[PDB]
Amino acid sequence: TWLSDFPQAWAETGGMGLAVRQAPLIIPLKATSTPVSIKQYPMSQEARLGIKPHIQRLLDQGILVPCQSPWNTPLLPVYRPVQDLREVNKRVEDIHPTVPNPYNLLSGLPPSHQWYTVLDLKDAFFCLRLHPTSQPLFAFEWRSGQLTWTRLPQGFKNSPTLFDEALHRDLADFRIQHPDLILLQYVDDLLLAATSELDCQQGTRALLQTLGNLGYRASAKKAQICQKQVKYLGYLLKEGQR
Amino acid sequence: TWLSDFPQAWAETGGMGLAVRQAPLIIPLKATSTPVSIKQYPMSQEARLGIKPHIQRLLDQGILVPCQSPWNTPLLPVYRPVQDLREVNKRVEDIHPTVPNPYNLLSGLPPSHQWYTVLDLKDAFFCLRLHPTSQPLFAFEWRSGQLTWTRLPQGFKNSPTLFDEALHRDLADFRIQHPDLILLQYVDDLLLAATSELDCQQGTRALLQTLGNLGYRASAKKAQICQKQVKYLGYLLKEGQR
DNA sequence: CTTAT
DNA sequence: GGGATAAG
DNA sequence: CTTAT
DNA sequence: GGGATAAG
């Protein structure tokens, strides 16, 4: 099956990802920024007990580490943690947004290619390491002491663009080696298109092999493999329509 | 004095005006209009007693007359009567607004003419008769029976423009007979300008003579006669400035 | 008094 | 959207 | 919890 | 202008 033949490529079997070819990211601050330290508003026991097993799993995975930082932003009770990074985002230098909008992205899908595979990458931002100099930016309090992220965090304003650019670099060779395949990238949402079912099969095997090798992980549960009709970015792609 | 020499021209001495050269005005309705009859909301005794001597004076002057009309609009308690003519105005055909705005009107005052007389005409709209066919438009209730206006009423949307146009017709000959005078008309607010005090004096006498003869009446109390500096349309005209 | 802004 | 406001 | 719309 | 709302 597709699962057993690519155990490294699937999140279900290959473990948490880590983009091994990507240098740990340095996050430049705006020219005038200084650290901001916001007090953690006290969390109810109910919310703390809800968040706790997630924090422990992230610590075990090395995605969170203890630290002491002049930066601090609060965790919200939503349970699983959401960080209010708005004051950090204001202090980080802006980058040009290079993620295309889905409508324009789908224009690059010609009617000759009608065999589709759709993959979504699991915990995509966590696959990108943060440089130790930038890790303290994202610190928060956990009860006492601070923790921070060693990977690109949720809620950081530049994570979608940085991830899209990183995966484009890592898949550039795949594109060159398979010039007859169409590969659309929308951050962690991927579409591969081919002319024949065989070509889609061969291309999907190469893409999964490459993704796992690079340290990314796709969701086996949600994968749509070598279908004539798939759901991608909120569209139903059928008959070459939409 | 200016008062004693022109007893017909001043409202204080000449009685209520009546523009004897102007045909009674016919007020055209919009193509689809039918009469509207709005119930008089009951008025307090205090407001009725306040309004009463004004109604009696207007009846004595012939400016109000009894009538029966399919039109009716309410009187408001403000005492002296104000009519809510909004539903009548909506049903009357629009006319082009030809009254100039004061800023543009004052542009026509050259620096050569710096001797000024300012007159304001008293009860100006009441000087214009309404044709009997149009009188029922403006009916209201007075306690029981209806009254209506035999002269152009306050609150009617076209009264300023119709009055301005009427007085322009009545003063056209005055302008031709005094080509060296500047005469600005803003509805009932008049400015006469001349080069010398004598010319202003002579021109003011001719203008008052003509106004009284035509049936208009100026306020002696407010008249500014042959001054180098006057208040007109909210401006202070001094040094040829403003 | 109701009604446009 | 509504109540404070100005105006007929 | 705070805060932009 | 403020309270209901969505989002970090």
JSON list of C-alpha atoms in Angstrom, two decimals, chain A residues 77-177:
[
{"chain": "A", "resi": 77, "resn": "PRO", "atom": "CA", "xyz": [-7.03, 29.45, 27.19]},
{"chain": "A", "resi": 78, "resn": "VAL", "atom": "CA", "xyz": [-8.81, 28.41, 23.96]},
{"chain": "A", "resi": 79, "resn": "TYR", "atom": "CA", "xyz": [-7.82, 22.96, 25.33]},
{"chain": "A", "resi": 80, "resn": "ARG", "atom": "CA", "xyz": [-4.48, 23.46, 23.52]},
{"chain": "A", "resi": 81, "resn": "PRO", "atom": "CA", "xyz": [-2.23, 26.53, 23.71]},
{"chain": "A", "resi": 82, "resn": "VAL", "atom": "CA", "xyz": [-2.50, 29.63, 21.53]},
{"chain": "A", "resi": 83, "resn": "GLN", "atom": "CA", "xyz": [0.09, 32.37, 22.02]},
{"chain": "A", "resi": 84, "resn": "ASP", "atom": "CA", "xyz": [-0.80, 36.08, 21.65]},
{"chain": "A", "resi": 85, "resn": "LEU", "atom": "CA", "xyz": [2.18, 37.05, 19.52]},
{"chain": "A", "resi": 86, "resn": "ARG", "atom": "CA", "xyz": [0.75, 40.39, 18.34]},
{"chain": "A", "resi": 87, "resn": "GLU", "atom": "CA", "xyz": [3.34, 42.48, 20.22]},
{"chain": "A", "resi": 88, "resn": "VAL", "atom": "CA", "xyz": [6.19, 40.33, 18.91]},
{"chain": "A", "resi": 89, "resn": "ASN", "atom": "CA", "xyz": [4.89, 40.54, 15.33]},
{"chain": "A", "resi": 90, "resn": "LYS", "atom": "CA", "xyz": [4.80, 44.36, 15.53]},
{"chain": "A", "resi": 91, "resn": "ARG", "atom": "CA", "xyz": [8.53, 44.37, 16.40]},
{"chain": "A", "resi": 92, "resn": "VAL", "atom": "CA", "xyz": [9.67, 41.94, 13.64]},
{"chain": "A", "resi": 93, "resn": "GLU", "atom": "CA", "xyz": [10.78, 43.32, 10.27]},
{"chain": "A", "resi": 94, "resn": "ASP", "atom": "CA", "xyz": [8.28, 42.76, 7.50]},
{"chain": "A", "resi": 95, "resn": "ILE", "atom": "CA", "xyz": [9.01, 40.54, 4.50]},
{"chain": "A", "resi": 96, "resn": "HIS", "atom": "CA", "xyz": [7.43, 40.59, 1.07]},
{"chain": "A", "resi": 97, "resn": "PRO", "atom": "CA", "xyz": [4.48, 38.17, 0.90]},
{"chain": "A", "resi": 98, "resn": "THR", "atom": "CA", "xyz": [5.34, 35.60, -1.77]},
{"chain": "A", "resi": 99, "resn": "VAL", "atom": "CA", "xyz": [2.62, 32.98, -1.18]},
{"chain": "A", "resi": 100, "resn": "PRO", "atom": "CA", "xyz": [0.35, 33.20, -4.27]},
{"chain": "A", "resi": 101, "resn": "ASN", "atom": "CA", "xyz": [-3.38, 33.46, -3.81]},
{"chain": "A", "resi": 102, "resn": "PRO", "atom": "CA", "xyz": [-5.20, 30.17, -4.55]},
{"chain": "A", "resi": 103, "resn": "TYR", "atom": "CA", "xyz": [-7.11, 31.52, -7.55]},
{"chain": "A", "resi": 104, "resn": "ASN", "atom": "CA", "xyz": [-3.91, 32.51, -9.34]},
{"chain": "A", "resi": 105, "resn": "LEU", "atom": "CA", "xyz": [-2.10, 29.36, -8.20]},
{"chain": "A", "resi": 106, "resn": "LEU", "atom": "CA", "xyz": [-4.76, 27.19, -9.83]},
{"chain": "A", "resi": 107, "resn": "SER", "atom": "CA", "xyz": [-4.37, 29.03, -13.16]},
{"chain": "A", "resi": 108, "resn": "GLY", "atom": "CA", "xyz": [-1.10, 27.12, -13.58]},
{"chain": "A", "resi": 109, "resn": "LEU", "atom": "CA", "xyz": [-2.93, 23.81, -13.91]},
{"chain": "A", "resi": 110, "resn": "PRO", "atom": "CA", "xyz": [-3.35, 23.02, -17.64]},
{"chain": "A", "resi": 111, "resn": "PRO", "atom": "CA", "xyz": [-6.17, 20.79, -18.93]},
{"chain": "A", "resi": 112, "resn": "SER", "atom": "CA", "xyz": [-3.63, 18.23, -20.21]},
{"chain": "A", "resi": 113, "resn": "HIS", "atom": "CA", "xyz": [-2.84, 17.21, -16.61]},
{"chain": "A", "resi": 114, "resn": "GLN", "atom": "CA", "xyz": [-5.95, 15.66, -15.05]},
{"chain": "A", "resi": 115, "resn": "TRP", "atom": "CA", "xyz": [-4.57, 12.94, -12.72]},
{"chain": "A", "resi": 116, "resn": "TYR", "atom": "CA", "xyz": [-4.16, 14.48, -9.26]},
{"chain": "A", "resi": 117, "resn": "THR", "atom": "CA", "xyz": [-2.54, 13.77, -5.91]},
{"chain": "A", "resi": 118, "resn": "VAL", "atom": "CA", "xyz": [-3.17, 16.11, -2.97]},
{"chain": "A", "resi": 119, "resn": "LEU", "atom": "CA", "xyz": [-0.93, 16.02, 0.10]},
{"chain": "A", "resi": 120, "resn": "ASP", "atom": "CA", "xyz": [-1.08, 18.17, 3.20]},
{"chain": "A", "resi": 121, "resn": "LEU", "atom": "CA", "xyz": [2.04, 18.44, 5.34]},
{"chain": "A", "resi": 122, "resn": "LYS", "atom": "CA", "xyz": [1.57, 17.85, 9.06]},
{"chain": "A", "resi": 123, "resn": "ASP", "atom": "CA", "xyz": [3.06, 20.27, 11.60]},
{"chain": "A", "resi": 124, "resn": "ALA", "atom": "CA", "xyz": [4.73, 22.08, 8.70]},
{"chain": "A", "resi": 125, "resn": "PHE", "atom": "CA", "xyz": [6.01, 25.16, 10.57]},
{"chain": "A", "resi": 126, "resn": "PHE", "atom": "CA", "xyz": [7.47, 22.97, 13.30]},
{"chain": "A", "resi": 127, "resn": "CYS", "atom": "CA", "xyz": [9.67, 21.36, 10.63]},
{"chain": "A", "resi": 128, "resn": "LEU", "atom": "CA", "xyz": [11.66, 24.61, 10.30]},
{"chain": "A", "resi": 129, "resn": "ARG", "atom": "CA", "xyz": [14.27, 25.17, 13.00]},
{"chain": "A", "resi": 130, "resn": "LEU", "atom": "CA", "xyz": [14.74, 28.56, 14.64]},
{"chain": "A", "resi": 131, "resn": "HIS", "atom": "CA", "xyz": [18.29, 29.84, 15.13]},
{"chain": "A", "resi": 132, "resn": "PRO", "atom": "CA", "xyz": [19.15, 30.00, 18.86]},
{"chain": "A", "resi": 133, "resn": "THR", "atom": "CA", "xyz": [19.56, 33.80, 18.58]},
{"chain": "A", "resi": 134, "resn": "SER", "atom": "CA", "xyz": [15.90, 34.11, 17.54]},
{"chain": "A", "resi": 135, "resn": "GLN", "atom": "CA", "xyz": [14.41, 31.51, 19.91]},
{"chain": "A", "resi": 136, "resn": "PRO", "atom": "CA", "xyz": [14.05, 33.91, 22.91]},
{"chain": "A", "resi": 137, "resn": "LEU", "atom": "CA", "xyz": [11.67, 36.13, 20.86]},
{"chain": "A", "resi": 138, "resn": "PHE", "atom": "CA", "xyz": [8.84, 33.65, 21.34]},
{"chain": "A", "resi": 139, "resn": "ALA", "atom": "CA", "xyz": [9.12, 32.91, 25.07]},
{"chain": "A", "resi": 140, "resn": "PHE", "atom": "CA", "xyz": [6.13, 32.44, 27.35]},
{"chain": "A", "resi": 141, "resn": "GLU", "atom": "CA", "xyz": [5.57, 31.50, 30.98]},
{"chain": "A", "resi": 142, "resn": "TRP", "atom": "CA", "xyz": [4.66, 27.99, 32.11]},
{"chain": "A", "resi": 143, "resn": "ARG", "atom": "CA", "xyz": [3.85, 27.09, 35.72]},
{"chain": "A", "resi": 144, "resn": "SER", "atom": "CA", "xyz": [7.54, 28.65, 37.37]},
{"chain": "A", "resi": 145, "resn": "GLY", "atom": "CA", "xyz": [9.75, 29.64, 34.46]},
{"chain": "A", "resi": 146, "resn": "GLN", "atom": "CA", "xyz": [9.75, 30.43, 30.78]},
{"chain": "A", "resi": 147, "resn": "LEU", "atom": "CA", "xyz": [9.68, 28.11, 27.77]},
{"chain": "A", "resi": 148, "resn": "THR", "atom": "CA", "xyz": [10.33, 28.98, 24.16]},
{"chain": "A", "resi": 149, "resn": "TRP", "atom": "CA", "xyz": [10.12, 27.43, 20.69]},
{"chain": "A", "resi": 150, "resn": "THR", "atom": "CA", "xyz": [13.02, 25.88, 18.79]},
{"chain": "A", "resi": 151, "resn": "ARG", "atom": "CA", "xyz": [10.92, 25.72, 15.61]},
{"chain": "A", "resi": 152, "resn": "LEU", "atom": "CA", "xyz": [8.90, 28.27, 13.61]},
{"chain": "A", "resi": 153, "resn": "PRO", "atom": "CA", "xyz": [5.84, 28.96, 15.80]},
{"chain": "A", "resi": 154, "resn": "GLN", "atom": "CA", "xyz": [2.14, 29.26, 15.14]},
{"chain": "A", "resi": 155, "resn": "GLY", "atom": "CA", "xyz": [0.88, 32.82, 15.17]},
{"chain": "A", "resi": 156, "resn": "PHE", "atom": "CA", "xyz": [4.16, 34.34, 13.97]},
{"chain": "A", "resi": 157, "resn": "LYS", "atom": "CA", "xyz": [3.33, 36.67, 11.11]},
{"chain": "A", "resi": 158, "resn": "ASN", "atom": "CA", "xyz": [6.04, 35.45, 8.71]},
{"chain": "A", "resi": 159, "resn": "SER", "atom": "CA", "xyz": [5.66, 31.67, 9.18]},
{"chain": "A", "resi": 160, "resn": "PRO", "atom": "CA", "xyz": [3.48, 31.00, 6.09]},
{"chain": "A", "resi": 161, "resn": "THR", "atom": "CA", "xyz": [5.81, 32.88, 3.73]},
{"chain": "A", "resi": 162, "resn": "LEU", "atom": "CA", "xyz": [9.02, 31.50, 5.26]},
{"chain": "A", "resi": 163, "resn": "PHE", "atom": "CA", "xyz": [7.67, 27.95, 5.04]},
{"chain": "A", "resi": 164, "resn": "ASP", "atom": "CA", "xyz": [6.50, 28.38, 1.45]},
{"chain": "A", "resi": 165, "resn": "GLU", "atom": "CA", "xyz": [9.90, 29.74, 0.45]},
{"chain": "A", "resi": 166, "resn": "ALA", "atom": "CA", "xyz": [11.77, 26.98, 2.30]},
{"chain": "A", "resi": 167, "resn": "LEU", "atom": "CA", "xyz": [9.79, 24.17, 0.70]},
{"chain": "A", "resi": 168, "resn": "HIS", "atom": "CA", "xyz": [10.21, 25.75, -2.74]},
{"chain": "A", "resi": 169, "resn": "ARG", "atom": "CA", "xyz": [13.99, 25.61, -2.23]},
{"chain": "A", "resi": 170, "resn": "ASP", "atom": "CA", "xyz": [13.82, 21.99, -1.06]},
{"chain": "A", "resi": 171, "resn": "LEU", "atom": "CA", "xyz": [11.60, 20.90, -3.99]},
{"chain": "A", "resi": 172, "resn": "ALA", "atom": "CA", "xyz": [13.45, 22.79, -6.76]},
{"chain": "A", "resi": 173, "resn": "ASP", "atom": "CA", "xyz": [15.42, 19.70, -7.76]},
{"chain": "A", "resi": 174, "resn": "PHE", "atom": "CA", "xyz": [12.28, 17.55, -7.79]},
{"chain": "A", "resi": 175, "resn": "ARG", "atom": "CA", "xyz": [10.76, 19.97, -10.31]},
{"chain": "A", "resi": 176, "resn": "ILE", "atom": "CA", "xyz": [13.86, 19.77, -12.52]},
{"chain": "A", "resi": 177, "resn": "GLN", "atom": "CA", "xyz": [13.90, 15.97, -12.39]}
]
